[PDB]
Amino acid sequence: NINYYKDSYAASATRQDFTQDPKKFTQPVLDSIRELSAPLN
C-alpha cells in the first residue's frame, strides 16, 4: 500500500477484486427460469 511517486500508475497492483457476476454470461434471458420447473411451458 505504498507509492513513491505522485503518478498513480507507477504503483504496484491494487486491492483485490473478490467479486464475480456470472449471471450475465450463463443466464442472459428475460423470463427468469427456476431450477425445479420445466423451462418450456
Partner 1 sequence: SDRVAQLTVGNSSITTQEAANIVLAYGEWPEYCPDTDATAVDKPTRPDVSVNRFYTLDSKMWQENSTGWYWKFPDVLNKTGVFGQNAQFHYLYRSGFCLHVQCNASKFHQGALLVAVIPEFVIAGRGSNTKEAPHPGFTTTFPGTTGATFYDPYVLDSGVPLSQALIYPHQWINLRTNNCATVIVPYINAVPFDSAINHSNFGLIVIPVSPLKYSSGATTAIPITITIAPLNSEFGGLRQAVS
Partner 2 sequence: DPVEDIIHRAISSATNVESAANTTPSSHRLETGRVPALQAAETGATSNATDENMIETRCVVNRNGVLETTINHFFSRSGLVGVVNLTDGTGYATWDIDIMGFVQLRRKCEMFTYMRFNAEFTFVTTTENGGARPYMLQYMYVPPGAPKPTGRDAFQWQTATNPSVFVKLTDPPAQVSVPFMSPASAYQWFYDGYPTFGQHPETSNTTYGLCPNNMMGTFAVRVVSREASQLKLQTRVYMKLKHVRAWVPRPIRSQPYLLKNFPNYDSSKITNSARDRSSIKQAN
Partner 3 sequence: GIPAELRPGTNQFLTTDDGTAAPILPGFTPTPTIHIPGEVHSLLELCRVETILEVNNTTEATGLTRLLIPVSSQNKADELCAAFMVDPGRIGPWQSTLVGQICRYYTQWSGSLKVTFMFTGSFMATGKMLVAYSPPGSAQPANRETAMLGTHVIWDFGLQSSVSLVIPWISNTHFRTAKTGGNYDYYTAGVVTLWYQTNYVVPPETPGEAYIIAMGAAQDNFTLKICKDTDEVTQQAVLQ
Q: Which residues bind partner 3 (CB under 8 A)?
A: 3-7, 9-13, 16-17, 19-22, 24-26, 38-40
Amino acid letter, 10: A
Under the criterion CB under 8 A, does residue 31 sit at the interface with partner 1? yes
- CA end-to-end span of the chain: 55
- 4 vs 20: CA distance, rounded Å: 32
Per-position x/- string for 9-38, each x denoting binding to partner 2 as judged by CB under 8 A, each - no binding: xx-xxx-xxxxxxxxxxxxxx--xx-xxxx
Contact positions toward partner 1, by CB under 8 A?
23-25, 28-31, 33, 39-41
